[PDB]
Amino acid sequence: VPVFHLFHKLLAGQPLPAEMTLAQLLTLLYDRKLPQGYRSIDLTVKLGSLLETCPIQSPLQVFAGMGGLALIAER
Amino acid sequence: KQLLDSGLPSLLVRSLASFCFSKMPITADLVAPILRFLTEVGNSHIMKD
Incomplete structure (x- = not known):
């Protein structure tokens, strides 16, 4: 089929889905000890x-993880 | 690996902290170039660590 399948060295033999976002790909790679x-x-x-x-956890979630946003509304 | 072993980034980051509270002296006209140096070398995950 004249289509393009993306691969990765760590996830060898498994073409990536076209609907995956890059955050999920970072999660998968960091699971693979990248x-x-x-x-x-x-x-x-x-x-x-x-x-x-x-x-993957964006910086806002990490900041909101420890209740950082609570201080924001305080000021 | 051997860039950090030379101690130059460690020497710089100490001078940044010394200047901010206001050895290699640092003027206000040189902070930005060396901050950009730290940013540029920071592409490698070794520097990020």
């Missing part, structure tokens, strides 16, 4: 269920 805060994501394009993975 070093934290890596500079890039090395995907490979090759011609021709994981959507449930939780998106």
